[PDB]
């Protein structure tokens, strides 16, 4: 998933874009990855 | 005028007008790369 970043590959972002602007793309991507991992553990607590 | 600062440095030099762009965090080009590099988390002011 992109989560509204320009791509879903970290090496692509870092190759494609310069550090001050790569950082906001990475931060958008890790926000969606935290939300999805946090969602998984919440479902696992309810199943447990 | 409201703050206090731990330490303060003043750095001084001459460059061409169109290079002044490079005196900012995360920039690149001959000046930023080989002459004077600001850190990406710079706190301070650039005056020209």
Curated annotation (Swiss-Prot), chain A:
Taxonomy, superkingdom: Viruses
Reported function: Subunit of the fusion protein that is processed upon entry into the host cell. Mediates fusion of the virion and cellular membranes by functioning as a class I viral fusion protein. Contains a viral fusion peptide that is unmasked after S2 cleavage. This cleavage can occur at the cell membrane by host TMPRSS2 or during endocytosis by host CSTL. In either case, this triggers an extensive and irreversible conformational change that leads to fusion of the viral envelope with the cellular cytoplasmic membrane, releasing viral genomic RNA into the host cell cytoplasm.
Name of the protein this chain belongs to: Spike protein S2'
Gene: S
Swiss-Prot record, chain B:
Start and end residues of each stretch annotated as Integrin-binding motif: 16-18
Result of changing residue 30 to N: In strain: Beta/B.1.351, Omicron/BA.1, Omicron/BA.2, Omicron/BA.2.12.1, Omicron/BA.2.75, Omicron/BA.4, Omicron/BA.5, Omicron/BQ.1.1, Omicron/XBB.1.5, Omicron/EG.5.1; May enhance affinity to human ACE2 receptor
Subunit structure as annotated in this protein's UniProt entry: Binds to host ACE2. RBD also interacts with the N-linked glycan on 'Asn-90' of ACE2. Cleavage of S generates a polybasic C-terminal sequence on S1 that binds to host Neuropilin-1 (NRP1) and Neuropilin-2 (NRP2) receptors. Interacts with host integrin alpha-5/beta-1 (ITGA5:ITGB1) and with ACE2 in complex with integrin alpha-5/beta-1 (ITGA5:ITGB1). May interact via cytoplasmic c-terminus with M protein. May interact (via N-terminus) with host bilirubin and biliverdin, thereby preventing antibody binding to the SARS-CoV-2 spike NTD via an allosteric mechanism.
Role summary: Attaches the virion to the cell membrane by interacting with host receptor, initiating the infection. The major receptor is host ACE2. When S2/S2' has been cleaved, binding to the receptor triggers direct fusion at the cell membrane. When S2/S2' has not been cleaved, binding to the receptor results in internalization of the virus by endocytosis using host TFRC and GRM2 and leading to fusion of the virion membrane with the host endosomal membrane. Alternatively, may use NRP1/NRP2 and integrin as entry receptors.
Name assigned to this protein: Spike protein S1
Organism whose genome encodes this protein: Severe acute respiratory syndrome coronavirus 2
Complete-protein stretch covered: 388 to 435 of 1273
